[PDB]
Every structure is written in C-alpha cells, then in structure tokens.
Amino acid sequence: SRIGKLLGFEWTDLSSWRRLVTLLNRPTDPASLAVFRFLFGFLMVLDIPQERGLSSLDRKYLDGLDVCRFPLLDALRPLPLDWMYLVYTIMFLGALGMMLGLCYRISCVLFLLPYWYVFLLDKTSWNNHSYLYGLLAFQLTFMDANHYWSVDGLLNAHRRNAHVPLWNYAVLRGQIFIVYFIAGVKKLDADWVEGYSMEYLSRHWLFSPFKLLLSEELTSLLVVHWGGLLLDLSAGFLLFFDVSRSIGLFFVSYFHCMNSQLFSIGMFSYVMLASSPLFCSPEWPRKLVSYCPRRLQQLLPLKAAPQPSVSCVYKRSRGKSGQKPGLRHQLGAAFTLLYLLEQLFLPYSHFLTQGYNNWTNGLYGYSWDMMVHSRSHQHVKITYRDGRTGELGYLNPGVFTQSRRWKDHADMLKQYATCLSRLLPKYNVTEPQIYFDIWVSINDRFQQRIFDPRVDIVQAAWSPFQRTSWVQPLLMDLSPWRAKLQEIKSSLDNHTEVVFIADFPGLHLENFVSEDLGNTSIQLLQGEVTVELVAEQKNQTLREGEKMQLPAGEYHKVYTTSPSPSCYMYVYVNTTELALEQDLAYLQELKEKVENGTPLVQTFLRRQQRLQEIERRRNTPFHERFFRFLLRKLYVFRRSFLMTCISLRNLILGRPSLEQLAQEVTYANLRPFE
C-alpha cells in the first residue's frame, strides 16, 4: 500500500457506489468531534450577547419608530419586541444545550432556526464569520457529536463512547479547507498582489521584528500581502498531511493569534484556532489525557475501548461478510458529496444573479473575500420633487436607516427609495420622485459616481437576474494614475487637502464652497472641462495642466465637455483653522515665554487633558485596562439578562403600570460597581 497512509484509503475504495458508501461509513473515534462541539457551543454562547445584538434589542426594535429595513425577502418582517426577546432566549438555550450535549438534536434545531431567521431579517449585517457560524451549526445538526463528553451519556448508556461514521470528520475538514482555498483563490487580484488593499497595516507594533531587516514598503508588500496569500493557499495542504502537520499548525496558530489582535472580528479567530485539531487523529484527546500525571488520571472518565454503534458500518474479514447499506448509510454519503459541491459552487455563482452585481460581484457575506476592497465615500446627496406642486427639496442622507451599506448596492437603494416614498407623505410631501448622487473611491482610486443621478429610483426597474442599467461603470483605465496621485498627496503640506474627481461626459458637478475655505483652486489633469461661476454667469474652458482659482461662499459648476472622462483635483486649505492655530500658537508661546522669564483656550486645554490621559494610560500597566474590560463585559451581560427577564415577565404575566417598568429600566441600566 504505497498510497494508504498519505491519504487514508486506497484507489479501489472509489471504484463503485457500494465501495464508496462502505468507505464513508467507516467507524471512528468520536473524541475530537466531542471536544470541537463543546468549544463551538461555548463560543456561540459567549458570542450571542455581544455580536448578535441582544444588548441593543430595545434600541433596534422600538415599538413605534420609523425605520427602513433591508431583508432578503420583503415578505419577512420582524415581530414585536417581547417576541424578539423570546426568540433570542430560545437561541441562547439552544447554544447552551449544544455546548453541554444535553438533548443534543432538539438543542441543535433550537439554535439553528432563530439564528437563520435573524440572519435573513437584515442584509446589512452579513459578513463571512456569521455565515460560517450558521454553516457549522447546520453541519452539527446532523452529526453524532454527543457520543463522548456529553451529559446524555451520563444519563443514557448508549452515548457513552460509541463509534461515529467517517464522513462526520470529512465534511468538517472539507469545509475548513474550502474557506482557506476559496480565500486564497480570491486573493489573486492585482489590487492585492500589488499592495493596495492593506497599505497601513504594517505600521502596527506587532510587525516590529520584520522591520529590523526590512523596509516599511518591503514589509508591507512582502509580509502582509504575499505572505498572507501564500499562507491561505498552503494551509489546508499543510494541515492534511502528517509529515507537515506540526509546521502547518504552528503557522496557522501564529496567523490566527496575530489576526485576533490586529482586527475586531468577534470570535472568528478562536473558532479557526479550535477547528485546527480536527485534522489530527480522532483519538488525540485520549492520548492527551493519558500523558497527564497519574494524580489527575483517576477523576476523569476512564479510558476504555469504544463500543459499537448503529450509525457506522463494520466490514471485517472474519467478523461476518458485510452489511447491506440501508437508508441511513447512503444518505450520509450523498449529503457529504452534495454539500461539498454546493459549498464549492456558491462563491462562483455571480454570473446567474446579475441584479446583485455592482462594481463588486454579489452581496457581501458568502464568498470568502475578506479585506480585498476598501471603500471611501466623499459625498451623498438626496433630492426629491413634489408630485403635486413641483418644488425641489433635499433630505439628510440616511434619515430612517440604522446602517450605511445602502450606498453601495442597487437593491438596497431601491428598498430605501420605496421606504422613503411610503414614509414621506407623513411630512406633507405628495408622491415624490427621488434622485441620488453618491461619490465613491475604491482602493485609492479617483472619486466617481456609482449611480446615475438623473434617474428616478422609485420608478426604476430592478430584477434579481437582470443586470442593472443605472449603475455607472468603474473607470478601470485610470488605475495606473495611483502612483502619481500618491506622489501629489505626499508632496503637500500639513494643512493642505486634495480631492481627486473623475467625471463622465455629459454630466456636471454643482459645488458650494464654504466661506472659511479660502485659497481653493482646481487643476485639470486629463480631458477638458468648463467652470461656470453662478453669481457672475461667466464660463471658462480649461486645458490639461491649467489651474483656476475659485471664490469662497459662492456656487460654481464644472461641466465635462470631452468625449472621454476627465480628471481634475481640488486644492484647498481651511483658512479659519489656519488663523486660529497660528494665533493660538502665538498666545501660548508668549504666555510661556513670559512665565519662564475663548474657544481656543478651551480646545487647547481639552487637547492637553487628552494628551495627559493618553500618557497616563501608556505609563499604567495592563492590569487596570484588563479590569476595565472585564467590567464592561460584565455590564453588557447583566444588562442583556435583565432586559430579557423584564420582557419574558411582560410576555408571561402582563405589563404593569408605567411606573414599575420605568423603575426596572432605570435599575437595569445601572453600572454594577465602579
């Protein structure tokens, strides 16, 4: 058997459906599966009050406030606040039951259903690790993970060390390998292989040892980008094979420990750290409990040979001939194959749902593309026209929204426009027509429009499977300007700002320059533009390299007259801020020189107080910050528990008068002890 220890099976095991079913139902030790179940349940229990939003349920789902919401299906609606609290309570009970191993399958369903309901209620909170938590719960619902270290065995002789089928480990290993490979297959973009995605990450103090032998640019390009891509592409292969398992384990442990401190991503790094020993032998916890000293080997459960179980199948040369697979042995193999195929296909299915394709493909959350694209937003304008009188008005951007992801997607923009159209008649506005003007730059590009500003979105056509026509294409043949843009930006002072704009032919930009923005100019970089002064009604054509000075406190318009897109930039300085800073410096220097020999004073003293606080925090040890962190966490947990108790009591018995409820609310918001 040449290949019988590098892969775990032989080529003859895949020569028939029956042989494949026999191979995939091979009995296995369940200890590692049990440890993983315990750890995932604990992590989900800890995660529910923090990231799932139990501590802000009253703020999010108030009784009678006007909110625009973005569900995947518009038919999906939230429940009243008390029923929302009940849903969260059921989810928490399910997570606790999953962790303990008590009533395993009912607990699995009780966690799985409200979690996915909450996920599908709101598209603006989707990310990759929440999607992964849902997928893992779905997998664990169909697994025999309560056969070792549960409470079910310590009450029912059947689930005390029994065997499990082989595909339970196969599905989990395939899932972890998929995410790793998929993540390393989406990092083959030129915006990442060229060092644009995370250019400021290497400035952290955690990259100091690399700077000893490398420069800043070289440590940003060599280590953060290419090193990360290599780790992503090689982690699964390194972990699969046992000759490289220790090296791979050390690398992934360092990677996830670094990521836990670099970002704020909840419990994703710890789930990834805990999912790595699933690649080792299924019996490693037994060896670990055997290696410990004998003085602690008499209180833990005894180590014995695992008992036979009905879930798996037994093929022996002398122990009878064979058992014909039933309806349970073939279903596991079919589920494994189909689930792995679907997990492989879904991150590459964007050619079918074209109505969700903006500058970036698909909705964010299920494609394993983390930290590849970074967005900057310069300006948002919303304008309406009254349908009965005809006046024009302007709205504050994001009035009835609780998030900001509506500026990048056309489906969310359509939902927001419909919500605004339905809610505006409450403010003496007849059937309106709404227009949007949003300026975005992606990965340090030219700022441009994403949507057509001349199209009314209330009547615009949107379909899930049709490409949207009112989305402005990304100007790809302008990216090589980035080096010149960085040169220009670095060639400025400490009180001068610059904005780079790319405009489409046939459109125009209306801009009101603030009164305090003295010394504002515009320089043409490509194409041709015309600048119109509104007060003086005077036009002026510009050619490449031309610079023009603009007045403050007035209106001006820029017209794009080239047959191709044109690029220009704004240079401006806050004259009021400059004068205030210089006179503050004058006054402070004079006072200090006299000593050694009024909003500005307030700002300076508060800045000095901030610096003193920062210095004191730097000088103090980390134990005080640890105590503060623990106090904050305990406050969050206590408030969540008290709110849940109040809501449950209201639901079960009945709401009291408007005094006891206020007293309870005031009591719950009390800090435990300072």
Partner: peptide, 28 residues
C-alpha cells in the same frame, strides 16, 4: 433633521466622517 437646504446639500468639500476603519468584516 429630516430636511436640508440648498446651501448645505451641496457642500462637497466637507469632512465626510471617517468612522474609524469600519470595514465590512469588522463589527465594532
């Protein structure tokens, strides 16, 4: 404030906000 005036709705060269980093993967 639900509504804006013409002058304040066209102030393009203003500080946007820059709410920390706040990338799509982070929770914060």
């Amino acid at each position: 404030t639900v509504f804006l005036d013409h002058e304040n709705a066209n102030k393009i060269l203003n500080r946007p906000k820059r709410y920390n980093s706040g990338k799509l993967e982070e929770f914060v």
